[PDB]
Ligand binder design. Sequence first.
Ligand SMILES: OCCNc1cc(-c2n[nH]c3cnccc23)nc(C(F)(F)F)c1
Length: 308
Amino acid sequence: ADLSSRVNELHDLLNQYSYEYYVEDNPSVPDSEYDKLLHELIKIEEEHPEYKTVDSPTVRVGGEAQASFNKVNHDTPMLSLGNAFNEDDLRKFDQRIREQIGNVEYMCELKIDGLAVSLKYVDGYFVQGLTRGDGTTGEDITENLKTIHAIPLKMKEPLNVEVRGEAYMPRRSFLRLNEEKEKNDEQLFANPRNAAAGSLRQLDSKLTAKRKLSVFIYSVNDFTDFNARSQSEALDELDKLGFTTNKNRARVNNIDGVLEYIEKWTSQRESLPYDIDGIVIKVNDLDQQDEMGFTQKSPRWAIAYKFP
Ligand SMILES: OCCNc1cc(-c2n[nH]c3cnccc23)nc(C(F)(F)F)c1
């Protein structure tokens, strides 16, 4: 049967509802509308398998295909962060940028306590997902990463990019999993991060799919195809491109702004639906980052404040 109209209708709708549920936090139809359409698309794909596609909404539920866990080199090494433990540490970081390159805007973000990942896109399609590993070599967990709804299977522009994201289990989901685990005499998960690790380290993606995992995208390997002149702009650019990012990001004009942000999120962290273990602070302008460059270990243009 021709069926192209109904398949495309279902892709339009199921992509629409999945984006509303997992990226926005505002669904537009009940669970039942999404559950009915998805069962229909699965049934079409069962009876008419020529309609199945690499980026179908049905990918989300996991398949028979197993994550290899093969050791795979990142396109570009994933940068590692230097740490700050107080305000003095932060004024030293601010002092040393401003002595070199002058006065800067900062980009402040919540530091997602997750599993760092590389998400490689070819012609706008999700094709490879690796753990961070040693920063240079990771493990291929692609088949499990694909079941995370906050990861687009297809970008709005056909880009050859490798994005970096923090993959995580929402706390509420972590707590109900431990409820289920306690009720079924299974040893409990230690924290959201270990639960998200265990579910990603699955050989079975169907099992990953039933875990309520998400992602926040923080960086990209190459800014050639991006019009962004700053980190703040690159995340807005990532939004328009189809990616899930943290909305709590803030551009501040100075280190008083930086400490003001830390003060807010010390006293607001409790209420978040996800674990954070710090605040990442970056020089916002991209040219200025290039101007600050790197030591042997880390960016000089970025620091992670760690919670006490
Ligand atoms: O544990 C290794 C984390 N590596 C990095 C994470 C983030 C990062 N930026 N924003 C985030 C939010 N949550 C967690 C991590 C990051 N940014 C960098 C960079 F600045 F060097 F590029 C490296």
